[PDB]
């Protein structure tokens, strides 16, 4: 293809809205008409009316914070073995991040659904009702400790 | 990339002048006056192009009425016979044969006094 004639496809050009005209868009600039319109209508999300919002809900969802804030206990993240059959061997968190899971959430636990290739998976924990689902396969050593 | 007005705003005011030709005083040289009286025209011309028939629709009848009453009968009594004769011809204009040879129309009259009396 030469330099010109490489136009776009279709359904993609901008032609944005130009509401300063005389029969295209209206002489009130689109979504305006009544009044109280030049700056803003406050935030139509959490507010407006001036009644009581809908913040009238109760926030029991506790442990809403202290002072030093969060605390460093490790995030246990699980992983469904459905695609653990994509590979095989002494699979370790070391590469499970390289595959496309965990992502330094760290502390890998295995669980899930499906046939498991008797592939000996080393991790930090295993779901019981899946561990016998592994017991009919191979071997599963545990993490270091805590 | 600035894009001043320039050509655009003038040429338009020249077109309104172009249609405001012969309009009294400021109504043809002052722009936003010429804009106005053009609004009424296109409206005045609209309605009247709907009206020009009713004008002639009326005129024809009087001439017709002028003719029938020169035989001795009214327009109301004239038309019925023609209609009784079932003659979807008479375009109320084409009944202008009162100075376009009359016997052609004078003997349309007697073909009316038939089917009614």
């Amino acid at each position: 293809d030469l330099r010109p004639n490489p136009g776009a496809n279709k359904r993609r050009k901008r032609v944005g809205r130009g509401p300063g005209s005389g029969h295209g868009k209206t002489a009130t600039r689109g979504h305006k008409g009544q009044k109280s319109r030049s700056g803003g209508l406050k935030d139509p999300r959490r507010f407006e009316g001036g009644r009581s919002t809908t913040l009238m809900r109760l926030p029991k969802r506790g442990m809403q914070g202290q002072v030093p804030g969060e605390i460093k206990r490790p995030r246990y993240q699980g992983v469904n073995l459905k695609d653990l059959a994509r590979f095989e061997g002494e699979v370790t968190p070391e590469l499970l991040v390289r595959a496309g899971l965990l992502k330094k959430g760290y502390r890998l636990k295995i669980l899930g659904e499906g046939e498991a290739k008797p592939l000996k998976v080393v991790a930090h924990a295993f779901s019981k009702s899946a561990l016998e689902k592994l017991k009919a396969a191979g071997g599963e050593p545990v993490l270091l400790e805590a | 990339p600035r894009a001043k007005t320039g050509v655009v705003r003038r040429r338009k005011h020249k077109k309104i002048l172009k249609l405001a030709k012969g309009y009294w005083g400021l109504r043809s040289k002052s722009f936003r006056k010429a804009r106005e009286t053009l609004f009424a025209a296109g409206n005045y011309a609209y309605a009247h192009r709907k009206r020009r028939k009713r004008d002639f629709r009326r005129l024809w009848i009087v001439r017709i009425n002028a003719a029938c009453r020169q035989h001795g009968l009214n327009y109301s009594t004239f038309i019925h016979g023609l209609k009784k004769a079932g003659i979807e011809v008479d375009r109320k204009n084409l009944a202008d044969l009162a100075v376009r040879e009359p016997q052609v129309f004078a003997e349309l009259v007697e073909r009316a006094k038939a089917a009614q009396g």
Binding site: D1, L2, R3, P6 | -
Partner: protein, 99 residues
Amino acid sequence: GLAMAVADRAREGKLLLVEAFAGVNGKTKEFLAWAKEAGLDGSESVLLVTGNELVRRAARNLPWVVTLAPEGLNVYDIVRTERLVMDLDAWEVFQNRIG
């Protein structure tokens, strides 16, 4: 996008890898005869790639031939020019990109 355009000249044949040069040194005259003995008669435009800063000189003043280092194969200039030329010194990085 780098690949697509290269085959576009291959798909039309408008391609050439080179390696031999009567103009391995600096002279615009020491090139246009090379083009004569290769097939570029000033009819249509050309992009050129080489890792030698001498040949560039030998054509940096060529209106229908724009310089290009082996790296920034800008798809602009590729599609810009109506024909393409490149070298192995390119066809190892273009390969190390994809190949």
